[PDB]
Design a protein around this ligand. Structure first.
Ligand SMILES: CCCCCCCCOCCOCCOCCOCCO
Ligand SMILES: CCCCCCCCOCCOCCOCCOCCO
Ligand SMILES: CCCCCCCCOCCOCCOCCOCCO
Ligand SMILES: CCCCCCCCOCCOCCOCCOCCO
Ligand SMILES: [K+]
Ligand SMILES: [K+]
Ligand SMILES: [K+]
Ligand SMILES: [K+]
Ligand SMILES: [K+]
Ligand SMILES: [K+]
Ligand SMILES: [K+]
Ligand SMILES: [K+]
Ligand SMILES: [K+]
Length: 670
């Protein structure tokens, strides 16, 4: 079925399938895309708390910007940015915590590489690099009464309860609750963090009727907020990264960020070859912050911290309804889906940038003045209203005993947004557009264990508004249509799988031309190769490895200083290697190592500002034992074991590494 949880692959660290938006779940070997799905077991073994913790440690395609000391994580995938706000939830946008998705309630975290507008519609944030999808935990038949306690340097103490029960005839009903409370000093100087999280996953499985409800509350409170380093007009070189414990932004920064959501989902089998489905959900997101971005001034590490207060009240609704069925026109099977989706959001987002305070990269900042930001006090006005709605039709044509599979789709995507000035309430912009966006794929299975494939699909982003500097200040540009071609090969030898893919993604870029009109006449052309190996090649020895190579060409810019140069914040080379080993010499003892590599990259489109490659090494240990009939597992995670300090490049800015960080936990099942 479309919604059946894909089984775990050999080794239990990844799964055998993942969601393809409106098409539902597909096995890796029947997906004409590059998909990876990480399991709860991998989450729990690595003591990963966020999407970022997980993807950075394991995935060769994903690299994190911001990091855990910052209020936000973003992701780069196939040399494009992917916003945390663009992470899906069972294939739906707008329902997960806006700045940073927690994963201690997740059964899977999945990554579909490359744009996928046909499959899911436009992402709220306009991301086209790839779609990250979280699958919520459900209650298993066996009852779960799990408690764990944890410690993370320097003094964060936590507790996590995971309780599940199924009930009724044939265990038709499921209830799974997760609660976390984690609090205390982080690894970084003068920083502390509080984190409460509550989730519930509720399901009913009947004969023809399948229902679920997911609820989530979370809050992230920071005392001390790490922020990026911006390049300044005459930066000529990027200083060497400081000790990752140093905190060189605003000493008395804070964040309070709260997200909560609910989504209800259903299917009903109207006949043996016809199923209706729908989902309705929404999200409230409350944001309060004072912090500062650090700006490079000169070239020996001096900075200026540019202070801001930001307050946000964000209210999102997200829904889908559709039909899927199947028929035969002779030797050909049709598996068709007709879907319609809607995201509606009202946001108030106010800010004021006041304060410029001198600091240094190599120094943890002292207490400094907090400007008077009381002009943002009171109720937060509406600053934006957005409505994204689409209708799609797809058909997977299966031929020759399902060994050839041709998928075609088209979607009509509507976009509408209105903006209002934060001070005056004046209507500033109103964008209303539509785009038709198709896909086509083919997959052939020469062997049971070998799949070859090609796809074409697009990605959409809402057009930018012209900066106030420009001749066309305020004017909203047309949507950016990204286009992907990909081919690849997947080979499953039973215990492990190797994949290869080649892609290209072309996308318009906007810039201010030499006559001060902001135009989307730029083109980026990202072409790359991806290689992966995963599974359990020997008994008790699990491996996840991979490497990418990408040429992220700014193939059209006008400006000769940048033309045909590399897009900033996009390393050409990346790789990961992870090994998890059950020691045959001690019962219950498993040892993990990981190596993460990121090649050199640039911060600027002229490519005068390069930042070096980097390496991180992680070490883990888990020890499973019994006490009084009950299973316990003690774990250790050592992230960045070598204590390396490194910049991650982005476009016009960089984010500092986290320090060497030890986590310990004990888990008990009752
Ligand atoms: C009492 C405060 C709670 C902190 C949890 C500590 C977890 C102890 O586990 C240690 C396991 O280390 C060895 C792993 O192998
Ligand atoms: C059959 C398992 C159902 C378990 C649900 C328990 C819900 C606990 O609610 C959390 C309230 O905690 C207070 C936070 O303040
Ligand atoms: C737009 C408002 C919709 C938000 C409703 C979300 C409800 C979240 O409930 C989470 C509760 O979890 C603890 C049980
Ligand atoms: C099974 C299909 C729909 C089930 C009923 C949905 C009830 C609404 O759930 C909460 C959504 O809140 C939206 C707030 O915006
Ligand atoms: K899934
Ligand atoms: K890995
Ligand atoms: K970012
Ligand atoms: K998308
Ligand atoms: K959008
Ligand atoms: K957004
Ligand atoms: K824990
Ligand atoms: K706005
Ligand atoms: K590069």
């Amino acid at each position: 079925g479309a919604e059946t949880l894909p089984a775990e692959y050999a080794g239990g660290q990844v799964a055998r399938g993942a969601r393809l938006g409106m098409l539902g779940n597909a096995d890796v070997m029947d997906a004409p895309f590059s998909i990876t799905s990480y399991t709860a077991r991998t989450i729990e073994q690595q003591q990963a708390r966020s999407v970022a913790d997980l993807l950075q440690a394991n995935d060769p395609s994903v690299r994190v910007v911001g990091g855990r000391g910052d209020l936000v994580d973003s992701y780069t995938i196939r040399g494009f940015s992917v916003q945390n706000a663009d992470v899906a939830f069972n294939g739906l946008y707008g329902l997960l915590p806006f700045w940073r998705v927690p994963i201690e309630f997740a059964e899977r975290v999945e990554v579909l590489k490359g744009p996928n507008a046909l499959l899911g519609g436009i992402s709220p944030g306009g991301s086209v690099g790839g779609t990250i999808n979280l699958v919520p935990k459900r209650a298993d038949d066996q009852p779960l009464t799990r408690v764990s306690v944890d410690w993370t340097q320097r003094g964060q103490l936590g507790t996590h309860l995971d309780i599940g029960r199924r009930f009724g005839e044939n265990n038709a009903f499921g209830v799974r609750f997760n609660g976390v409370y984690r609090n205390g000093d982080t690894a970084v100087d003068h920083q502390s963090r509080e984190f409460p999280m509550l989730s519930l996953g509720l399901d009913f499985r009947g004969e023809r009727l399948r229902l679920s409800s997911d609820l989530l509350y979370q809050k992230e409170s920071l005392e001390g907020v790490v922020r990026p380093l911006l390049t300044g007009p005459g930066t000529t070189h990027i200083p060497h990264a400081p000790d990752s414990k140093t905190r060189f932004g605003l000493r008395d920064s804070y964040l309070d960020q709260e997200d909560y959501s609910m989504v209800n989902r259903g299917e009903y089998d109207l006949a043996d070859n016809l199923t209706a489905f729908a989902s309705i959900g929404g999200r409230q997101s409350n944001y309060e912050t004072i912090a500062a971005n650090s700006i490079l001034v000169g070239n020996q590490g001096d900075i200026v911290n540019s202070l801001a207060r930001q307050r946000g009240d964000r209210r999102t609704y997200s829904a889908e309804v559709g039909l899927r069925g199947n028929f035969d026109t002779g030797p050909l099977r049709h598996d068709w889906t007709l879907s319609a989706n809607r995201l509606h959001e009202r946001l108030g987002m106010v800010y004021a940038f006041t304060g410029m305070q001198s600091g240094n990269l190599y120094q943890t900042s002292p207490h400094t003045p907090l400007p008077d930001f009381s002009s943002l006090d009171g109720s937060i006005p509406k600053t934006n209203e957005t409505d994204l709605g689409g209708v799609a039709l797809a058909d997977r044509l299966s031929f020759l005993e399902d060994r050839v599979q041709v998928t075609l789709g088209v979607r009509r995507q509507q976009i509408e947004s209105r903006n209002y000035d934060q001070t005056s309430g004046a209507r500033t912009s109103h964008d209303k557009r539509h785009v038709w966006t198709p896909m086509a794929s083919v997959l052939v299975k020469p062997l049971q264990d070998l799949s070859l494939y090609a796809n074409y699909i697009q990605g959409l982003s809402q057009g930018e508004a012209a900066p106030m500097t420009a001749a066309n200040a305020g004017q909203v540009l047309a949507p950016y249509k990204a286009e992907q071609y990909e081919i690849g090969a997947k080979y499953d030898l039973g215990g492990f799988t190797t994949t290869l893919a080649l892609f290209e993604i072309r996308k318009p870029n906007a810039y201010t031309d030499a006559s001060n009109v902001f135009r989307a006449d730029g083109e980026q052309r990202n072409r790359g190769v991806e290689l992966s190996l995963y599974g359990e090649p020997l008994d008790g020895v699990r491996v996840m490895a991979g490497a990418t190579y990408i040429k992220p060409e700014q193939n059209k810019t006008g400006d000769p200083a940048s033309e045909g140069k590399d897009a900033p914040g996009v390393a050409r080379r990346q790789a990961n290697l992870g090994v998890s080993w059950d020691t045959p010499f001690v019962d219950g003892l498993t040892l993990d190592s990981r190596w993460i590599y990121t090649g050199s990259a640039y911060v600027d489109s002229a490519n005068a500002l390069a930042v070096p490659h980097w390496n991180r090494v992680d070490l883990g240990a888990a020890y499973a034992f019994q006490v009084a009939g009950k299973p316990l597992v003690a774990r250790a995670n050592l992230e960045n074991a070598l204590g390396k300090d490194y910049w991650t490049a982005a476009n016009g800015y960089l984010s500092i590494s986290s320090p060497r960080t030890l986590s310990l936990s004990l888990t008990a099942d009752f």
